[PDB]
Amino acid sequence: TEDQRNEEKAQREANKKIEKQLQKDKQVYRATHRLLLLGADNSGKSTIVKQMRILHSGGTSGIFETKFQVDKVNFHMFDVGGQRDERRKWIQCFNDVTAIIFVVDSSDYNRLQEALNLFKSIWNNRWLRTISVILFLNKQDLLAEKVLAGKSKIEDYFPEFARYTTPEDATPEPGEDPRVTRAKYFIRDEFLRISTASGDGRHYCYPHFTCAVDTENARRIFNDCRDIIQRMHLRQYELL
Amino acid sequence: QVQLQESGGGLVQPGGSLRLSCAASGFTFSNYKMNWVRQAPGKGLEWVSDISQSGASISYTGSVKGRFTISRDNAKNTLYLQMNSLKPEDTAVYYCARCPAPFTRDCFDVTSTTYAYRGQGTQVTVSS
Amino acid sequence: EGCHVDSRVDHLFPPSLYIFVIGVGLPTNCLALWAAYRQVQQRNELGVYLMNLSIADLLYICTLPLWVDYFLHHDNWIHGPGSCKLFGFIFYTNIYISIAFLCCISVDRYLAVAHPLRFARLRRVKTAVAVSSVVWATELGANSAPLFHDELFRDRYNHTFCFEKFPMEGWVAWMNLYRVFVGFLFPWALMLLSYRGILRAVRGSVSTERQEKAKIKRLALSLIAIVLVCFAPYHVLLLSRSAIYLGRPWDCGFEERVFSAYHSSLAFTSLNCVADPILYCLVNEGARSD
Amino acid sequence: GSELDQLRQEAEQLKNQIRDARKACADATLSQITNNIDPVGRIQMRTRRTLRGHLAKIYAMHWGTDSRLLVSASQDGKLIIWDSYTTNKVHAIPLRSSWVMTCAYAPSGNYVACGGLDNICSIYNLKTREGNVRVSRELAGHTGYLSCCRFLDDNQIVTSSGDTTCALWDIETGQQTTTFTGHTGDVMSLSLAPDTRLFVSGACDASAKLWDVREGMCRQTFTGHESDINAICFFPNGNAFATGSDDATCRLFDLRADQELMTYSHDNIICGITSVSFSKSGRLLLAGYDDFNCNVWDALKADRAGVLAGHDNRVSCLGVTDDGMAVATGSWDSFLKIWN
Amino acid sequence: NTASIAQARKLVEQLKMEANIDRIKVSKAAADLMAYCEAHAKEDPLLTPVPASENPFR
């Protein structure tokens, strides 16, 4: 008879208390959005992380965790840094994030093809489909001064740049020289061509030109995450 | 036991020509795609060209466009790189690489250091 | 008071329409209920409302053969006052519950698509169950009014009516006015506003192509139009009858002229039990994967 | 250059000698000897439980030695200890880092280990006098993410890492006692022998090695597969093991013969293997796939015998009870089912 | 350059150590595995279904 009493006690106490705590934890868990930060050594991803940490880390063991909040919605970004060169195994721990942030250094052409190849490899992975990508081109100032100087020519690395023509939808900034705009939009169109070649309707890429003095990146991420979540809701609620 | 063996190369005057060959054994040649990667003096690994399983979808780094050509021979498990109009800036070791998984169009760690499915390399020197 | 009434089509059109409705309604509604339960099991709270709507539709469908029998005998009831009471209650009540659950689905969709990051609390299964229970209880309590009266009458002519009389009693007119307004117009307006908001929100998407926006616009209009077409005529006729009664209680002249039209319009309102499964389950590809 | 060429040539000569010895040792195959054995093609079983409560995808699980309690790990940051018979939850440990990739259950039943993308192995105490579960030790020193861990007893534990090495620890002092430095790529899995005197490991380079726990050096290497090895498991008698690879096949190796002697593949199967496990007697071989199914193989005939369908996403982990009474499988759909 | 030579020497030493082990023909191993899997066939519930009474689950 004691066995039945013990089973009743265990069931009631343990399961009820644990379930209440689990529901409380779930409430908090469902109210936060998590993002993955990617980039190269010469990029400035850490700079942006620090900038919005100032604008708005503990337990750092190679992973730099950052928190910020826009319009009372909480975000959480992670930056893996304690790993070696090879990526193809620990990259699939992030198969259910809202978005991936991809940062490029557009003032250095000698390293452009490496970023192009990495973006192409990410876009086509079996487990990283269905995840949108935010694209930042981070060193527009250096690129502008580099192109103005004229010491080195883009066509050497990309001979197709000779026949390039500026697109109609381009909206140059008021004080921009036409050829700087030409070069920057060409570099962007390369990534967009890879993106649209073999993607799908369950996938998108949002590009932005950014620098080391911008303070609008938090709102860009916020708006893009809002668009992504709305598109997912359309499909969940059987309107698509 | 995956192994790749390169051949060819040597000394050549600027504007010369050579043909590189890479013999593969130990896996199904037609299931994977192949690449070319070279390491010039005082430099890291650099991706040159790749070719898909069937033989279409070729791609090059811009610096060698219009000069080099890549091809397969699925009946002999060999890869080729016909080089012409050589320049001094092409002096380097040339490795034969292949992707880690068969039926995929992503190739992640081919240019890393200590990548396993890569060849020993062959020295190509251009000078006078 | 009393007056002569007759018909010639109600023994032909209504029973045939009901016979057509039943066979297509039963299996389709069962499959829709299965799909809704699967969606609930996947932790989507639209499924709760879908199952409630399907259950209401099946409950309404189960009581049609009795009224087919009633219509075949030219408006005569032979199964007892208690059966008349119960079947009349269900047959006259389930429509408004179906409408209310359609409105609930519409509002849930509006909250989901228009505020992606605001109300995670409201979009839960627990809230869905609470709201569904409240809706069921409130609808039944508010429509229980005619269950405390006599619902079987015999006229001088060869008629034995159930839940109707010509001329009707005073309380029936007020019941009819409340029915028309509260149980038809309000949920319809809520649905219209919710889908308007859905379209306004969706217009701003950057990841969506023009073809998909066109498809969504088509679907919303179809959903609104089906309900209007199915339900408008019977309610306009009911409102006119009630108003004329409040005008001159003793005058039955008008009631004599629109008897067949009233009965045909009443019979016409059963097509929703077949329309709803199609539009809300089959058109979607994911739900069609059963 | 000349010395390097000589070293490479002599390495090739030793490779040729090893290949010649392996060829000489082969005089038959499992298929010929086992051709007369009857099949077991009537294998069919259904799910008997479904454990709910995890918020995110399940990455690992491990049975307790009593084959009643089990521990599970999820990437929302929870270790939940379930009661299998009644489906009750016994404990729930929050974790400092949510990117857990492995978990272990102490054979004595007093501790559970945990680790992941933080390069640490944390030990938890389940029987503290205060009636709470608290951290009791942290092991640090790996330079890559933790892929697997297994208790030897209450005091020592062996782990594998993404830095290509394995280690042996002393829990009381938290110090590395031995290191194993043979592999060339990431090490993805471990498996201890029944006597705990040896263990095997598979790496991203398509090869597996055998280690001596006390001596501390590798003794054998196996090079049959074509791509990354994702799972490994010892045979019940401790004289063979099996591996699962990204080339969509499984293979069985032979310690005494030093040779591969079986392959499990099908033409219409194109995805890779994620987990493997043997039954109590070793006549069955269960493997999870990137597609959401799980196939039961015939380890002697090599023909399929059944399937386990019902998960809505990638099958990640897999385990079998010490008494061979039930099979547990986790998945990326966040549910943990028990079959048969 | 010296690091490559050291790595090559270590690899050669490992190969030499591994090439001096005494093996056995595959037939003995196959026979032993067959005998083991046969001798423990009666203790596998997943092979022979367990009656509902004796099932801890269900």
Instruction: Give domain limits for chain B.
Output: 3-124
SS3 D204: coil
SS3 D30: helix
- Rounded-to-integer distance, Cα D42 and Cα D32, Å: 23
Torsion, CA D224, CA D229, CA D233, CA D235, rounded to 10: -10
- Rounded-to-integer distance, Cα B68 and Cα B87, Å: 12
Which chain D residues are Cβ-neighbours of E24 within 8 angstroms?
25, 256-257
Both tokens of residue A133?
A: 């990508």
- Rounded-to-integer distance, Cα C66 and Cα C275, Å: 22
- Rounded-to-integer distance, Cα D175 and Cα D169, Å: 6
Q: Do the Cβ atoms of D127 and D85 come closer than 8 Å?
A: no
- Rounded to 5 degrees, φ, ψ at D221 are -145, 140
Both tokens of residue B93?
A: 């070791």
CA distances from C84 to C10, C62, C77, D104 (A): 19, 15, 7, 68
Both tokens of residue C157?
A: 């002519």
C195 CB neighbour count, 10 Å cutoff: 21
Residue A2 in any domain: the answer is no
Count Cβ–Cβ pairs < 8 Å, chain A vs chain D.
68
Residue A96 in any domain: the answer is yes
Give the distance from CA A96 to its chain's centroid: 13
Within a 13 Å sphere around the CA of C226, how many CA atoms are in the beta-carbon half? 18
- Rounded-to-integer distance, Cα D62 and Cα D51, Å: 14
SS3 D267: coil
- Rounded-to-integer distance, Cα D107 and Cα D64, Å: 7
- Rounded-to-integer distance, Cα D28 and Cα A8, Å: 60
Closest CA to C112 of C47, C48, C201: C201
Give strand pairing partners of D135: D124
- Rounded-to-integer distance, Cα D77 and Cα D74, Å: 6
Which range marks the domain in which residue A144 is found?
A: 7-237
- Rounded to 5 degrees, φ, ψ at C74 are 65, 60
Residue A136 in any domain: the answer is yes
Residues from A in contact with C at Cβ < 8 Å: 27, 30-31, 33, 73, 132, 201, 204, 206, 225-231, 233-234, 236-240
Closest CA to C13 of C261, C240, C276: C261
Least CB-CB distance to B116: which of D184, D246, D247?
A: D184
Kindly determine whether residue B62 and residue A156, on different chains, have CB atoms separated by under 8 Å: yes
Cis amide prior to C167 (ω within 30 degrees): yes
Identify the CATH class of B3-124: mainly beta
Kindly determine whether residue A126 and residue B104, on different chains, have CB atoms separated by under 8 Å: yes
Using the 8-state DSSP alphabet, how is residue A43 labeled?
Answer: S
D49 CB neighbour count, 10 Å cutoff: 16
Both tokens of residue A214?
A: 């911008």
Closest CA to E14 of B26, B117, D18: D18
Domains of chain C, first to last? 13-289 (1.20.1070.10)
- Rounded to 5 degrees, φ, ψ at C219 are -65, -45
Kindly determine whether residue E34 and residue D7, on different chains, have CB atoms separated by under 8 Å: no
Q: Do the Cβ atoms of D82 and D89 come closer than 8 Å?
A: yes
Closest-CA distance of chain C to residue A225, Å: 9
Instruction: List the CATH number of the domain containing A216.
Output: 3.40.50.300
Query: Residue for token digits 């940062």?
Result: A103
Chains D and A touch (3+ CB pairs under 8 A): yes
- Rounded-to-integer distance, Cα D47 and Cα A131, Å: 32
- Rounded to 5 degrees, φ, ψ at A121 are -65, -40
Least CB-CB distance to D14: which of E15, E41, E50?
A: E15
Both tokens of residue D274?
A: 């994620």
For E14-56, give the secondary structure using H, E and C: HHHHHCCCCCCCHHHHHHHHHHHHHHCHHHCCCCCCCCHHHCC
CA distances from C228 to C187, C215, C232, C275 (A): 12, 20, 6, 12
D61 CB neighbour count, 10 Å cutoff: 23
CA distances from C270 to A2, C273, C276 (A): 60, 6, 11
Residues 80-119 of C with CB under 8 A from A: 108-109, 112-113, 116-117
Burial class (CB in 10 A: 0-12, 13-18, 19+), D8: middle
CATH code for D4-339?
2.130.10.10
Cβ-based neighbours of C161, under 8 Å, separated by 6 or more: C75, C77, C152, C153, C154, C155
Closest CA to D136 of D119, D167, D112, D168: D112
Give strand pairing partners of D331: D315
Q: Any idea where the domains of chain E sit in the sequence? A: 1-58
Cβ-based neighbours of D29, under 8 Å, separated by 6 or more: D261, E26, E30
Closest CA to D277 of D288, D268, D292, D266: D288
- Rounded-to-integer distance, Cα D250 and Cα D31, Å: 16
Distance in Å from the first CA to the final CA of chain B: 40
**Buried-state track D199-215, b at ≥16 Cβ within 10 A, e below 16:** bbbbbbbbbbbbbebee
- Rounded-to-integer distance, Cα C85 and Cα D129, Å: 68
Kindly determine whether residue D340 and residue E5, on different chains, have CB atoms separated by under 8 Å: no
Closest-CA distance of chain C to residue A234, Å: 6
- Rounded-to-integer distance, Cα D222 and Cα C169, Å: 94
- Rounded-to-integer distance, Cα B124 and Cα A65, Å: 46
SS3 B5: strand
Using the 8-state DSSP alphabet, how is residue A239 labeled?
Answer: -
Burial class (CB in 10 A: 0-12, 13-18, 19+), C225: exposed
Give the distance from CA D70 to its chain's centroid: 16
Which chain E residues are Cβ-neighbours of D281 within 8 angstroms?
37, 40-41, 43-44, 47
Cβ-based neighbours of D264, under 8 Å, separated by 6 or more: D249, D250, D251, D285, D287, D297, D302
Kindly determine whether residue A238 and residue C117, on different chains, have CB atoms separated by under 8 Å: no
CATH code for E1-58?
4.10.260.10
Both tokens of residue B108?
A: 């992640």
Least CB-CB distance to E41: which of D8, D85, D281?
A: D281
Q: Do the Cβ atoms of D144 and A84 come closer than 8 Å?
A: yes
Kindly determine whether residue A229 and residue C201, on different chains, have CB atoms separated by under 8 Å: no
Closest CA to B27 of D273, A125, D245: D245
Residue A219 in any domain: the answer is yes
CA distances from A200 to A131, A205, C209, D112 (A): 11, 11, 12, 43
Record the resolution, in angstroms.
2.8
Report angle CA C14, C19, C23 to the nearest 5 degrees.
145
Closest-CA distance of chain B to residue D204, Å: 8
Using the 8-state DSSP alphabet, how is residue D325 labeled?
Answer: -
Closest-CA distance of chain C to residue A197, Å: 16
Which chain A residues are Cβ-neighbours of D332 within 8 angstroms?
95
Interchain CB contact of A89 with D (< 8 Å): yes
3-state helix, strand, coil in chain B (%, to 5): 5, 45, 50
Using the 8-state DSSP alphabet, how is residue A151 labeled?
Answer: S
Both tokens of residue B103?
A: 């039926």
Residues from B in contact with D at Cβ < 8 Å: 1-2, 26-28, 100-103, 114, 116, 120
Both tokens of residue C212?
A: 């998909």
Distance in Å from the first CA to the final CA of chain D: 62
